[PDB]
């Protein structure tokens, strides 16, 4: 398919690796009882192994010569061959939660600078104000692009600068 990679459900080293992990787990399994808790834990392990290999073969991942899933990081090639779930949807999910954390921290900083003890509200966290901003932070991309377009996202050149500049 992409880059000479076969799909994992078509790959043979993928099936060999699945069979090898089952072989190691059953060689460890064959030295216990039946209803014993080590045997129960190893059968749960084998169930999770089979479920994991079936889910990775179901998700349409691409395997190499080693039988291991390879990820495709190109928006157009991923959206063309059905691989947006591995890099593209995770990167927009990450950027949503990372801007969430950063915007809630920025709103807490701006809220606590407007008092007579900003360092005291930085050492001892104002929990109601922090939870208020943490719930209100869900509209952070809209609020961020609005603060961008008003010219209030950015401080002017009243910043601290060195002698050189």
């Amino acid at each position: 398919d992409i880059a000479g990679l076969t799909p994992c459900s078509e790959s043979k080293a993928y099936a060999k690796l699945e069979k090898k992990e089952l072989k190691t787990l059953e060689k460890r399994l064959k030295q216990y009882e039946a209803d014993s808790a080590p045997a129960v834990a190893l059968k749960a392990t084998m169930e999770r192994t089979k479920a994991r290999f079936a889910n990775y073969a179901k998700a349409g991942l691409l395997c190499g010569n080693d039988g291991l899933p390879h990820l495709i990081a190109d928006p157009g090639l991923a959206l063309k061959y059905g691989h947006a779930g591995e890099v593209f949807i995770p990167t927009f999910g990450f950027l949503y939660v990372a801007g969430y954390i950063g915007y809630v921290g920025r709103q807490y900083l701006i809220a606590v600078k407007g008092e007579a003890k900003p360092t005291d509200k930085e050492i001892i966290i104002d929990v109601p104000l922090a939870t208020k901003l943490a719930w209100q932070g869900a509209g952070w991309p809209l609020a961020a692009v609005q603060e961008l377009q008003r010219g209030t996202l950015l401080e002017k050149e009243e910043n601290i600068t060195v002698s050189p500049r």
Binding site: E157, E158, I160, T161, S163
Partner: protein, 61 residues
């Protein structure tokens, strides 16, 4: 220059609080070279929060 308690802006370039805002304590009326006493709410690396400045190093902003 500026009166007591008013906010100024520091333009001495090698100051720690250059391009930032402090508060005037007093202005000495002798022939002292740096009469404007400004306090800053943050400390420098020496842990000092107060410095003398000149009339053309402070701007009432």
């Amino acid at each position: 220059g500026p009166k007591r308690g008013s906010l100024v802006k520091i333009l001495r370039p090698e100051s720690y609080w250059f391009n930032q805002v402090g508060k005037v304590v007093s202005v000495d009326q002798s022939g002292v070279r740096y009469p404007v006493v400004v306090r800053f709410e943050n400390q420098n690396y020496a842990g000092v929060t107060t410095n003398n400045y000149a009339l053309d190093e402070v701007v009432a902003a």
